[PDB]
């Protein structure tokens, strides 16, 4: 389930060090480059005022883009803790310099279990992204396509009544997921698998 989540992100630009956590007990930071030279870089990070440490940088191709990443161990991926991050060239010029609270960089799985059913308005219902805790804190957003109306939902909801719909039109639905709380932020998940439904006579 990894590659996609990264590929999703890297469209967030090369000026920011892309970083996310999967179960708040991990951290992965990556950045893509070009393949013409590879380059020598030093990933240094500090947690609080503990001594700075170094992170082993690994290389990989994507096709012909090359991606450098580095994983952070579970003990020093506590939440609510300012964790600094520093990618530096062997020349010494800093390439990124970030401050992430690890609680703030979550990337959730796609929600599963989406169904729809109707005379009146339509009831969508679905399941929170599987094998992710804190299911009572998820944010979801749906997308009524036919042409693109997005209905926004908030903490802990797994259904919706699609008021103000149409008739004699094919409709497609989907729901994404993200953590949303005062101490919970991150990027939107990938869209759930879509469910289709044809409206009644009008």
């Amino acid at each position, epitope marked *: 389930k990894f590659e996609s989540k990264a590929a999703l992100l890297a469209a967030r630009g090369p000026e920011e060090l892309l970083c996310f956590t999967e179960r708040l007990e991990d951290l992965v930071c990556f950045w893509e480059e070009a393949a013409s030279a590879p380059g020598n870089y*030093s990933f*240094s990070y*500090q947690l*609080e*005022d503990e*001594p*700075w*440490k*170094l992170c082993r940088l690994h290389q990989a191709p994507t096709a012909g883009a090359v991606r450098f990443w580095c994983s952070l161990p579970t003990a020093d991926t506590s939440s609510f803790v*300012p964790l*600094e991050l520093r990618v*530096t060239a062997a020349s*010494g*010029a*800093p390439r990124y*310099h*970030r*401050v992430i*609270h690890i609680n703030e960089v979550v990337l959730l799985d796609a929600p599963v279990g989406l169904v729809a059913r109707l005379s009146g308005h339509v009831v969508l219902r679905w399941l929170p992204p599987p094998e992710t805790p804190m299911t009572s804190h998820i944010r979801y957003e749906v997308d009524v396509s036919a042409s693109v109306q997005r209905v926004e939902i908030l903490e802990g909801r797994t259904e919706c009544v699609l008021s103000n719909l149409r008739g004699r039109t094919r409709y497609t639905f989907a729901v994404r997921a993200r953590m949303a709380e005062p101490s919970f932020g991150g990027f939107w998940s990938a869209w759930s698998e879509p469910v289709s439904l044809l409206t009644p006579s009008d």
Partner: antibody
Amino acid sequence: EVQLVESGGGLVQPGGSLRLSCAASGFNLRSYYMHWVRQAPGKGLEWVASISPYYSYTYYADSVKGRFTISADTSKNTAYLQMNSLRAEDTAVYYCARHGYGAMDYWGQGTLVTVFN
Amino acid sequence: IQMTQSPSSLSASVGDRVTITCRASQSVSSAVAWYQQKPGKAPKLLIYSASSLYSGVPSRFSGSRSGTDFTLTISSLQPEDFATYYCQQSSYSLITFGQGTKVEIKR
């Protein structure tokens, strides 16, 4: 346990030289960012230089480049700021700090550089 | 990267709520810190990561971010709070401080 102690400040004629020392007790210096910051008398704070852990990468402020050089002796657990071509404007109290929490958490008491004619 | 504090000084009474603002120019990360300096003493850290209270700093001190405006707020001034205050920003290689804010007593 952490304590930063500085030395080497004093009076200096313009163009002369001083080497400041900053002795760090309570942590290893090779594993921390160290900063020199100076405070002109009755003026604000002005960052001067930095050195990075494990690679001793020096970074300076344009108002200090070339004339100052920041350095560290890992064995002595001490960071040094050499100031050459001193100017009347460099008269200030110079502090050494330690990077922590995204900022400078532990500060020395500071040492006074006076540039007199 | 230019950090501009306002006001440069203000006078308030004990128990007053006082808000200091710090204006960043270039795309500024949230690596902003707040410092206290009393006459002759070294700077003392109060806030880091723009909102987190340094261990031992009283609850009166708070930090917030509103885009390019970073604020330090003291909820209710106590006599040991009247000092000079600095905001600090670290960007990639450069570290800048605000021009400094002097908090004085209204009497």
